[PDB]
Design a binder for this molecule. Structure first.
Ligand code: 4DW
Ligand code: PLP
Ligand code: PLP
Ligand code: CA
Lengths: 453, 454
């Protein structure tokens, strides 16, 4: 045993699993707005000898020795992070160690707040993220809601937009120490200027959690939360198209100085994390360098055009869009006027190799079965899909919905619907036909990564 | 742009750096007891398309679709984890999603405790981990100490062992909900029978954080925490030799009326603390867990014990004192005070000759700010096919470092003077540059797990 044997030789059962997942990705139409396809170059860094190095601490300030090279990598990741988002290093710093987006958020909170201090975020069914505080009427769900005290803010159901007026009103009463501007299921641009005014008024830090939109921000195809936020968190996957990891950006220098840097860095290590995942950090550096190029601006422009094209294509075929359209990378479809719901559509589409998400619509409860569907452009755009290809994706979705409708008029409950798609031979064949057409279409497009895994 | 271009072609700057680090790992003697060298097989999984899949939730209970293969990979990683530690599926479960060791511990605490509930763990300078609870006298340091209330137990400073008497006494008073049996710098086996007695009396949960010794426990070359603990956490790197990730094992089924760990532990990992699983890590971990079930790994681990034994016996036989007198595991705690030096000095000398080891605070330390010891580990170099005579020769290289360290301590005043004297003084430079060249030439000749060039 050398530990230099190939995976296919040494673990054939695992190698066969990688190959099946590779085929599924190649043959599927990936419309999950948080999905993307990582470049080979980034994955080569990710599965590298950088996994082997413990480097607790920071560059030039490590616990263990032998970090000369790892220090250069982390420092380079830092520079490319600031360059990607066009940040003056006198005015901004960045921590590149969070293990993911959720740890990046928890580290911001533990850095700046005391246990049980107050946070406000977009409610989860209104399109916010678990890590912005989430508790149900029954219990505390996010650790954000356990260690801190959250109160959500809401959409205006009339417009499908964030109700900035109700946020202002309600923040005056609750008096949060931290307000989070950022979304998981929102088709529009956040009024960061308005968020900032509410924060200034109640003396709260503004956190922009730009995970979903970070690549669009890097490419300068939408306005930057960095103009208004104190702290910006993000994932490095999603629209940035890197390995799974996180980033915390913070202001530094004069506001009387900013005091985020030392607190943020201490919270990440030693308070929360152990050894940095240097292999991830390297992969992120690779993706961040990719994000500074003309190629990536053109990619991000195309993502917007494709989402528009998908939105327009849906409108023409008689669908309703929550907020009436999109200004970003995803669209929110309201299926209730069509007579179907998200849980039904999602399952039908899954069986024809189209992966989308059910999505709560404004006004409905976090209890009633979701009336909507979230569809995203980033992943397929990475496979060189253009506007005509997304029109074709919408054709396939429509057939999916129409099958979904017919199965609904023959079934009672949700579990009836789900096993009827498997058992009933006439509908299972109509799905088999659509699946094969979807996969023929999808397989012809290029796919970032390695060929076979 | 396809995203199928090579790293060497598209990012030459980064590729350079991967090669410099691969070279640094090859030419050095890696004596940090937390380090190891991951298999190519595992790295191939880690740098795969599994990075691309969002699979929040658990196998068969995902929030998004298209997870059929990722479900099987997670389930496989579970079964392989249980098999690696010889656990009955009816009596144990395992969560394979923690992003590292620290997240695995925090998730146990948030799963089983309320905020501000009480925790006890071996004090940090007495050989425990940050994540066991660590405050200084100035401030709270670990998040473990911010969100929960930690009181550290200690070593008996005569024996260098864990004072199981004081711990039983002090735990009757503090009333912890959770006591942690685990170490980062302890050369001996832990009395998990005794830990569980203390936990039974005061009605606390016993957590075994075996990160450091998980390979040794899988190999069955030391006794298992799974006989006495109801919760076990580990890294998947270190002695398991996998990718960076973590595991949480927990008891399940009938207690005496069921155990209720499973549901709380899984909920704490997701949705409470983490987001999307790192499926590429989960797969690499599964590969390494397969490797740990094999006869090859038992021999790897036996050789780890023997190589630490041989490093220990060799150090004793050159007139070095060692904390606790010996080792029953993968490392040796070297008290450098009775040889008239200390950790900070030794570490910086050894580093400049491509030997990487750790500063370590010993019981007999009379200052509290510069430690008087050195942690030296087997697992890494053993993975490179080192045997007892190779470790004797490492010790010989160390002895020359320590002796340059002793010979520079008598010619210097403070610790920052000591550090400059190494780089600045030409006779000490080229005595180090000579010792380095010989260490590198010795280390290079041994094999290295992973890819050849990155
Ligand atoms: N955009 C977006 N929106 C989402 O909602 C979402 C999710 C699911 C989030 C989520 C997870 C658990 C509960 C929860 O309530 N947990 C369980 C309750 C247990 C109990 O009460 O004991 C449950 O799922 O029933 C509620 C919500 C993943 N990715 C997402 N992306
Ligand atoms: C190394 C270690 C950890 C933490 O591992 P990371 O991957 O750095 O978070 C936790 N517990 C023990 C006992 C350890 O040795
Ligand atoms: C995806 C996302 C996260 C969390 O990322 P993970 O890597 O899954 O933890 C946090 N916040 C927002 C707004 C997100 O979209
Ligand atoms: Ca713009």
């Amino acid at each position: 045993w050398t530990g230099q044997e190939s995976l296919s030789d040494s673990d054939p059962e695992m190698w066969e699993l990688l190959q099946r997942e590779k085929d599924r990705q190649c043959r599927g139409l990936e419309l999950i707005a948080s999905e993307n396809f990582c470049s080979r170059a980034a994955l080569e860094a990710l599965g590298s000898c950088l996994n082997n190095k413990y480097s607790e601490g920071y560059p030039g300030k490590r616990y263990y020795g032998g970090a000369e090279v790892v220090d250069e990598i982390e420092l380079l990741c830092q520079r490319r992070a600031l360059e990607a988002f066009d940040l003056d290093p006198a005015q901004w710093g960045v921590n590149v160690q969070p293990y993911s987006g959720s740890p990046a958020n928890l580290a911001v909170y533990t850095a700046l707040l005391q246990p049980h201090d107050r946070i406000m975020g977009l409610d989860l069914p209104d399109g916010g993220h678990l890590t912005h505080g989430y508790m149900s009427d029954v219990k505390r769900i996010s650790a954000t809601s356990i260690f801190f005290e959250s109160m959500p803010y809401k959409l205006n159901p009339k417009t499908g937009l964030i109700d900035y007026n109700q946020l202002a009103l309600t923040a005056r009463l609750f008096r949060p120490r931290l307000i989070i501007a950022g979304t998981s299921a929102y088709a529009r641009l956040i009024d960061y200027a308005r968020m900032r005014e509410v924060c200034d008024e109640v003396k709260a830090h503004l956190l922009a959690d730009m995970a979903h939109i970070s690549g669009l921000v890097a490419a300068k195809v939408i306005p930057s939360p960095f103009k208004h936020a104190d702290i910006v968190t993000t994932t490095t996957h999603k629209t940035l198209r890197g390995a799974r990891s996180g980033l915390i950006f913070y202001r530094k220098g004069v506001k009387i100085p900013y005091t985020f840097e030392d607190r943020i860095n201490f919270a990440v290590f030693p308070s929360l994390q152990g050894g940095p995942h240097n292999h991830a950090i390297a992969a992120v550096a690779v993706a961040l360098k990719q994000a500074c190029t003309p190629m990536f601006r053109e990619y991000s422009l195309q993502v917007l055009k494709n989402a528009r094209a998908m939105a327009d294509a849906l409108l023409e075929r008689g669908y309703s869009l929550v907020s009436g359209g999109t200004d970003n990378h995803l669209v929110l479809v309201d299926l209730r006027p069509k007579g179907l719901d998200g849980a039904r559509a999602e399952r039908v589409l899954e069986l024809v190799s189209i992966t989308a998400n059910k999505n709560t619509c404004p006004g409905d409860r976090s209890a009633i079965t979701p009336g909507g569907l979230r569809l995203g452009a980033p992943a397929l755009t990475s496979r060189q899909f253009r506007e005509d290809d997304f029109r074709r994706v919408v054709d396939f979705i429509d057939e999916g919905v129409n099958i979904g409708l017919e199965v609904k008029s023959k079934t009672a409950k949700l579990q009836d619907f789900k096993s009827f798609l498997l058992k009933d031979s006439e509908t299972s064949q109509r799905l088999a036909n659509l699946r094969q057409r979807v996969e023929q279409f999808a397989r012809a497009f290029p796919m970032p990564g390695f060929d076979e895994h």
